[PDB]
Structure formats: C-alpha cells, structure tokens
Amino acid sequence: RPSSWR
Amino acid sequence: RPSSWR
Amino acid sequence: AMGSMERASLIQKAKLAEQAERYEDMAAFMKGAVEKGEELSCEERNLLSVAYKNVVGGQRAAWRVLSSIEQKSNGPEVREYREKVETELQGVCDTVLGLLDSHLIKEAGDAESRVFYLKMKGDYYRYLAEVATGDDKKRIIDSARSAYQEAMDISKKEMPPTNPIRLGLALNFSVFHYEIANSPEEAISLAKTTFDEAMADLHTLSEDSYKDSTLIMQLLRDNLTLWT
Amino acid sequence: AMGSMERASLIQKAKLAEQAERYEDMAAFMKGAVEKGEELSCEERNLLSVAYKNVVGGQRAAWRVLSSIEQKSNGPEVREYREKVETELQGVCDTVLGLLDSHLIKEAGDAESRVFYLKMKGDYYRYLAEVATGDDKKRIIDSARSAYQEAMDISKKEMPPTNPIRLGLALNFSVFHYEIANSPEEAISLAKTTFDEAMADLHTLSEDSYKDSTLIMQLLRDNLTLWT
Ligand SMILES: *Cc1ccc(-n2ccnc2-c2ccccc2)cc1
Ligand SMILES: *Cc1ccc(-n2ccnc2-c2ccccc2)cc1
Ligand SMILES: [Cl-]
Ligand SMILES: [Cl-]
What we know:
The complex is a heterotetramer, with two copies of chain A and two copies of chain C. By secondary structure, chain A is largely without helices or strands. Chain C has one domain (7-228): Up-down Bundle (Delta-Endotoxin, domain 1), CATH 1.20.190. Chain C contains nine helices and no strands. Chain C has helices at 7-19, 23-35, 42-73, 77-104, 111-131, 137-158, 164-179, 184-199, 207-227. Chain C binds chain D through residues 9, 12-13, 16-17, 19-22, 25, 58, 61-62, 65-66, 69, 75, 77-78, 80-81, 84-85, and chain D through 9, 12-13, 16-17, 19-22, 25, 58, 61-62, 65-66, 69, 75, 77-78, 80-81, 84-85. Chains C, D: GO terms for molecular function: cadherin binding; identical protein binding; phosphoserine residue binding; protein kinase binding; protein kinase C inhibitor activity; protein sequestering activity. Chains C, D: It is found in: Cytoplasm; Nucleus; Secreted. Chains C, D: Belongs to the 14-3-3 family.
C-alpha cells in the first residue's frame, strides 16, 4: 500500500 | 495496428 | 509436466493464475488439462484461449519493439535477441497448434467448439506468418487462410450472424486479409458485411447477448474507420 | 547460463530487453554480466536493479492476489499455487542476495556503489520478510534491518541529503519500519526528517538534480499523507 522507490 | 478480438 | 495433477485442479489453478495475471502459468495449466484427453467445455476453451493469447501477445509486442530497433540499425546483438524472442514465440505457436492437432479439432463435433478451434488455428498460423521470411512464409499464410475459411464456412451454416465466436472469427480473418495477405479490399468487405448482417439480427437478442454482440461489432467498426 | 556471451553484449541486450519489457530476460542478462566478475558502473547497477525489481514486483503482486484468495477461503489448490509463486519469489530473492554476496558488496568501495548494494540487500530481505511465517521470520527481518542500517550510516556520512540513492534508501527503510517491523512511528519520523533535510539542501542543486531529488521527496510526502 505505501510507496517504495519506483 | 488494427484490432483483432481482444 | 502436469500429468500428476487432477484435471479439475488444473482448471481451478488456471483460473487462479488468470486472477494473478500469471499467464504463462495459466497456459501451462490449460495445456495440462488439454493433455488429459477429454474434450473442453465452453468455459475451458475460453481459458485456454485467454492464456495463450496473453502469452503470445507479449511475445509479439516484444518482437515488434526489437524488429523496429533492428530495422532502424540496418553488432549482432539486436538481431540475435530479436531471433531469440522470435524463436520463443514460434515455440509457443507450435505448442498451441500441436494441442489443436492432438487432438482438439478432430474430436470437436459441435459448431461452437469446431469453429472456436479452427479460429485459434488460423490465429496462431497468423502469428507465425507475422514473423515469417523464408521459403515457408507462403505455406504458413495458406495454412492460416485454410483454417479461417473452414471456420467461416461452418459458422455461416451453423451460427447466427450475432454469434460472438462467428463475429470474432470474422474480425480476425479480416485482420488476416488486411495485415498478412495484402488484401485490404477483402478485409474491408468482410468487416462491413459481417457488421451489417449482425446489425440486422440484433432484434432477436436478449440484453446480455446484445451487449456481447455489439462489443465485437464495435471492433469491426473501429477497423473500418481505420481502413477507410 | 550466460558464460559464453561478452560482457558488453549482455549489457546491450539488457537494455534491449528493458525496451521490450522483457524483464526476466533483462534480469538474466544482468546476472550474466555480474558473474563476469568486474565491478558495475552506475548505469549498470541501475539496470540490474530495474530488472530484478520488475521481476520480483510481478511475483509480489501475484502472491498478494493469491494470499488474499487463500485467506478469504480459510481444496488444497489455492494454498498449493500460492506456495508455488511464493517459492519462485524466494528463489529470485535468493539469487539477487547471492549476487550481492558474491561478490558485489565486498568489492564496492565508493559510497554510491556500497549504499546502492546495501539498499538492494535490505529490499530483497524485505521481500523475503513479506512472505515469511516460520522460525526464520525474525532473522530475515533483522537481516533487512542490518543491511538498511549500514547503508544509512554510510549515506549520512558520505552523501548530501538530496542524493537520490540516499533518498530512495530512506524511503524504503521507512516502508520497512511501517510494513515489516511494526514501527509506524519510526517510519513517520524517518520520512519527515529525510524530507525536511532534503528541502534544506535543494538550494545547492542544478535544475536536473532538483528534478531528481524532488521526485523522490514526493514519494516520501505521499507516504506521510497516507500514514498521518
Ligand atoms: C475469438 C472469440 C470471440 C468471441 C468470444 N466471446 C465473447 C463473448 N463470449 C465469447 C465466447 C466465445 C466462445 C466460447 C465462450 C465465450 C471469445 C473469443
Ligand atoms: C533505490 C534508488 C533510488 C534512486 C535512484 N535514482 C533516481 C535517479 N537517479 C537514481 C540513481 C541511483 C543510483 C545510481 C544511478 C541513478 C535509483 C534507485
Ligand atoms: Cl540473445
Ligand atoms: Cl501449483
């Protein structure tokens, strides 16, 4: 659900 | 480029 | 590979892999189910088709990216990698055609199953044709044509003009004409009479069947708009 | 598998597979390049990371779909297939960790390479942690934590607060805190001081570096908005 490096 | 059954 | 798993488990896992967007797994599960030797239900035929269309769809998309790079450049690396992808694509097409030939088509008596499998046969020969360049290119084109034509003859005798398999078959045969056989006028003529005869048969359909048929008619219309 | 191909060809084909969105191929090409034994350039490290993040990203997405189905239901098929995907994911994480351990990390002397590889180490232990349930779950969590912590210590000593690797490292360590270690307050504190100290160092950057840094700061901000 949270953003990690994309 | 043209559409075949999708 | 799948010989020790139950047919029903293979089908169940095929559906799970579709939900997970694991289409290579899905194709392997449906291959295993086909190799059980029993005929496929309507829903099972769809699962088989969806799995391999997605697998080969990604290979065709990659082949086109690489062949475009290769053309713009003409080291051996781009050719080599395009050849690797192309070989893998051909392997998947050969596997599908093998399943149709051993023994899905010969056991298919109903029009819905027989047209469905002959349409698949034409499609996978079409995909082979897209990458063909050697002595067998004409023979591959004629194999696609022959499969589509038998499917069309059956569908016109045995199915109503709005039948979704009939409509999808005509759509793809017209793409064949336009894209592979260099017959754009044949492509346009088939798309138009297919669309017009489906229009005239819509009055016979329920709301859900109406939705099914008009969805595929809209793809015929999109192509006609592209081609004229 | 790639031992007979030139390093430079492996790198070239890695870039081609990225363009073709063939990330399994891309990962195999970069694995082959790593196994040549030479250190990796900045651009090559990115290629390695992009390839495996995409491969493992699809496996994690599939694992989550299947584990959600499995939970809603609790035949053995859903568990079996979730276990198959989970095993394949673990294999890919073990392969990346193996490459980092043999011998990317021990040969990395510069802060940019060493932080980059320690960040990767923490990420792939994090992915292992996401699926872990047995006796080794705590040990896997601590391995991720230990790798991230060494990376953070180096990055704070050796890099400016706006350095993209430093910022991406802090983003992912804060996701670790929130998602794996059950430490949402640690997650929020790190995201905020990382964001605030980067804000204060933007004045030193060129327009292009500014674009690089503020892109990753916006991911920190998105998470803070989700978590508070
Ligand atoms: C090639 C093809 C054409 C139409 C369909 N389709 C659309 C809606 N239902 C179906 C269908 C066709 C055969 C068997 C079951 C459903 C699918 C494929
Ligand atoms: C984990 C990670 C964080 C930042 C970046 N990134 C963004 C822009 N450039 C870079 C970069 C990082 C290392 C080496 C080269 C480029 C990538 C990955
Ligand atoms: Cl190759
Ligand atoms: Cl399985």
